[PDB]
Every structure is written in C-alpha cells, then in structure tokens.
Amino acid sequence: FVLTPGNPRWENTHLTYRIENYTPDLSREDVDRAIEKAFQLWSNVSPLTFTKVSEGQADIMISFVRGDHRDNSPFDGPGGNLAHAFQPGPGIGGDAHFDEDERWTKNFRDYNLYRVAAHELGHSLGLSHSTDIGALMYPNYIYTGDVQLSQDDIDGIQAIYGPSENPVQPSGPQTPQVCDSKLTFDAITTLRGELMFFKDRFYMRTNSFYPEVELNFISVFWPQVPNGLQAAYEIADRDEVRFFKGNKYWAVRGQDVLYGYPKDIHRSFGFPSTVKNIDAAVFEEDTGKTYFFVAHECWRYDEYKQSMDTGYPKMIAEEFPGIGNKVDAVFQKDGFLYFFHGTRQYQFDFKTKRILTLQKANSWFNC
C-alpha cells in the first residue's frame, strides 16, 4: 500500500457523499448500490461512516463526466482512462468523476462500475496506488469475478484511520509472497516446460528461464478454473492439464477448458463416496499412471483406460517412503517427483523409492 504524499486524511471519520448525476447505462438503483457497496468495503475495516445525500454539497461529490470537464484532467473517450478522484480536502477534495464514454456494467463485462468505484474511493480517503497485483488500489483495471479488498488495501486505510468496523477484526486475502519462507502451496503442476504453482486466487509461474516468479490471478490466466485449487496435474502427450476442487475437475487444452468439462471425480475416476476432495496428483509418465493423494492414501490410475489399479487405497507411507501422512502438492520433473508438505519439499527417486534431498518449498523461486 502507499499513502498519499503530505498524508491527506479526512479530519472527521463520518462523511457525507452525493451522486450528483446518474449514468443511462444502469438504472438508478443499480448505480445506487455500486456506490454504497464501494463505500461499504472501506467501512468494514476502519471507522469511516458515510451518509448519502441528495441536495447541497457533501464531502464526496460523484459525477459521471466525459472529455474536458474542467479540472485539468480531461477524459479520453471510450476505454483507457475510466475514472479519477481527488485526495482529502475542501471543494474538489474527495471528489470522484467517472468517464461516461465507458459502458458501465453490472457484471464481468468491461468496466464494472462497482470495481472502479472501490478504487477511486480509496483515493478520496487518502490512499495511492499499490504495487500489489491483488489490491483494488493497484493502478490498472483487472476485474476478477467479485470486488473484494486484499490485506494490502486494508493495511493502507487502517494506517490512516486505524482499524475496527467489524469488532471481530476483519481479515482480507494476502497476496502470496514468493520468498516469504512461511509460504505453502495448494497445488502445483509442471506445465509445458514451466512450473505452475497455485495458491488461493493466485498462480506463481517460473522455471524455464525466468528472472523471478510471475505472480497474477488464476482467472486472468484461465476461463473456468476455480480459486482454491486442491490439486492440478498435466498429461503432456495429450497436451492437457487438469484442475481439482472438491468433487469436480476441469480439463484444459492450451488456453481453454475442454468440451463440457467441469465434471465429476467420482463419475470420471471411480472414487468412493467418502472421497469428498483430493490433495495432490501426478502423471508418472514413465509407467503411464497418475497417483492421486487423498489424506494418507495414494491411488494409482491407469490413465490410458480409467482402470483404477487393483483396489489401491494404499498407505502413502508404504508407497512413497519417508514423506509422511499427507501431501500438499507434487509434480514430476527431470524424472524425480517433488513432494510438498508445508514449507519443506522432498526430491524423490521414483525408481529407487528413496528421498534424495530435502529442500525448501521456495527453492525454484530464485530466492
């Protein structure tokens, strides 16, 4: 997070605000909620309260404009520059203007008003752009399926107005820290010569030649793929990748999900009803079998046929010796299998059934 230079903050924490004019793109009530919801998220985590008015001045005047509207910052027409706001102060301070040449929407479609309103307000309250890719106060429009504050937006505003507003103190999603040594993973698949590490809403891409990891949203990379992946594996020859969440899985062939693919793990793979979700999975390309890890059970699956090999709910402890009782994520690189659990990973030699080395979870991260 970054606080605006000179530290402009509203001297009282309760403010008025007023929607001077409405966009013909949305009904009045729809424009009425994009705004209060935008205001709402800054309240939930600090002591700011807000009263909407319909006459006279208010601290935060909100207008839909376009082109030159006389404030030494004219808009640019359709796209590009969407909106802007002014830091705490009298007159124009706190004011937010949105570009009417934009199609203001109520869904994922280009230029969700709610998404833009939450950005501009953090300004109106004293905040500047965050370098955090997941923060709503990042500088560019990236819509992700909802509009929620990450931990960064929260620390920025509480750094000006202190905490509160849900005295069961609020927590917001923290964007993954690549070199933070307490970092653990949800899933990991090797993917066409690179490694795709998954965590919450984020993917950490690396390996093939990267001067550092690339952090960004799962949803900016792929269409259907959920957040909170549980396992993700790859089948190279079928130029294919699979993702798992709860009892469902999506298969993807380069850039998009295969025909009618969010499907069932129980129907497609043959799992007991007790199997409410999986923990990791790896296509062992030598033997042509995928291993699914469920708590402390390793299932082997004849990929080429769907033949769950003879019974197979086995003890990981007897199958893959020395790694433990559970797995976080696993992949196969250079022939080895990299088994993850917490912050430690084990280099396993599948052929001699013995751990060769123990390394950190972050070793591939150029840290």
Added chain:
Amino acid sequence: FVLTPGNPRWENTHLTYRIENYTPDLSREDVDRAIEKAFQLWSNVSPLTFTKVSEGQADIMISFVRGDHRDNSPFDGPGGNLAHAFQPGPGIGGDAHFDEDERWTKNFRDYNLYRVAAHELGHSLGLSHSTDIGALMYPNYIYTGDVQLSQDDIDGIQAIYGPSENPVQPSGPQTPQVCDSKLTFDAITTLRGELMFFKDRFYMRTNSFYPEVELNFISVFWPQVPNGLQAAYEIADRDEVRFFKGNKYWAVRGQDVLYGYPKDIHRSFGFPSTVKNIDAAVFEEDTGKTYFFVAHECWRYDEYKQSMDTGYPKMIAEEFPGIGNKVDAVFQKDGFLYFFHGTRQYQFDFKTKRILTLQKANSWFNC
C-alpha cells in the same frame, strides 16, 4: 487518420521482420500467425511486402518484454500499457515491443495478440492515433470480435504508400458520420427515453439531454446482438428490447439477452417461409400492437398473445399513407411514428393517418 510528424515512411516498400522472442502464453505457430495476419492487413491495401527472417537484423524487430527494458519507455506490469512501437528509421525504428506481463490470447479474452500487433505495426509503418473510434489505430484497446481495418486506417496508410495490393481496390468499413447528410439507417428503437440508431457495427445514441450523439460499437454495448441489425424495437412495460437479423431475433432485458434467446421469427411470430428477413418494427403502445415491415407489407401482431392479426400481409401504401413502398427504420415518440427511408423521415400521426412533416434522417442528431 493521423500521419506521424516529420512524415517517417520506409523508403522501400518491401521490408524484412523478425520475431526475436516468443511468449510462453501461446505456441510458436500461434504467435507466428498473429504477426503475419497483423502484417497481412497492411499489405492488402498498399504496396508493402514483408519477409520474415530468423537471423540477423531486420527492419522490424519484434520482442516480448516487460518492465524497464532500456528504451526510455518501461512497461507497467499486468494491464494498462499493453505494447508500443517506433516510427520508420534505422536501429530501433520500426521496432515493436509487447508487454509479457500481459496474458496473450487467441480469442476475445483480454489482450488478443493479433488485435495489438495490427495497432503497433501501423506505427512501424509511419501512422499515429486516429480519433476514429472504429479504427485499429485508435489509442485504446477495444476488441470487437475480429480484427479488421476500417476505411480510416486504409486512407492513412495509402496517404503514405499509395493504394493497391488487391487490384480490385480494397474497401474497408467507414465509421458512421453523424451529420453527413448522405447517412441512412439499418434500424432504430427508442430505448428508455433515448433513441438508439443502428448502422452496421455501430450504434448512435441520443435524445434525452445529449450535447451530441454518442457513436460506439453495438458489441461494446450488448453481449449477443449481431452487427447488421435489420430492425430493433422496444416493449417498455416488459422492460424489453428486441433485435432482428435474417430469420433470428434476440430479446434483451436491461444490459443482457434473455434466457436462450437467439430465436426464430417464423417459430416465435408466425411468418410465411417467404419471409427471409424483416425491414423495421414498432410496438404501437396505444393499441398494443407491433407493426412489422417486410418489403411493402405491414404485419400487425397482437403482442399480448402472439395472434398475428387476421391475415395481415397488407399494403404499407394503404396502411401508412404517403410514405412509400419500403421502410428503413421506424419508432414511436411523443405518440407519433417516425418512418425512415434513406435520408428522409416522415412524422406520421397514427390517429389521423397522415404525414404531418417531412424532416431529414439526421434531425435528432443535434446537427
């Protein structure tokens, strides 16, 4: 169109080019075609030829970069700034760099490489930003479902290199000219207190308080709605709008198309097989009937039931006296019906069945 100051143009019309490096987002061949297709569209309409190479320099070096890459224009990470290029000249002249922090896609999804490559190249060849909303050389990313050159991009490049490359001289879509007095319409529906005029890929919005018309893409406004609409009408009480193309129609309730709606005019409305498409349509809210215009036949349709009123393929000439043999577009405002045909429109009094005044098609356009 706008030509770059100092008029930088490549002194020979055949150029080499080379893709120094490829994006892991797309296979090599997919990155190979976004580029040649991008180059291709500038060829089709001028005398420029291009040879792709794989070693040594070339006039147009193309690289995927990110951040500071040392040219006094560093990228900004994910979103915002997507790419940039340099005018005709030695060394860096003609060179195009694309931001790798962008998810490079092969479809409508955010940041289609083909769409961006066509923009940057017009630069490499000597062009600057057009104020034409429909031009690929407009300054902001607006993807519309394809990547085609409008008439503006064409006139700009032929203004530097003269015509040719399909000696059946190419033509490209001209963006509607609001006040050009030779302008005619495809369809027109009044829409919640404003008027939506349709033409090709574009909508011209006006009326309720507008200090001029708003020109932009049909596809930036609505999801499913085709280009080349034939008729569009509204049913206010059902807060609903309908669009027509060939033998199909979409119904829309505020911002998106109703459930499973691209449907059949013959199935839904009861039209003879001879009815391959319609010309205009208007919900006459007084009588509760919609009139469909087909060549020189007016059909009346009991909207509240789907009862095509008794036979009804009638003579427009006897139904709506004095307007003619065909209609371009029609709507109902202030009780009157505004009948369009070419560049002239007729104010009709539905109750006295007589034209009150004749005006231009552009009269509502603040021209």
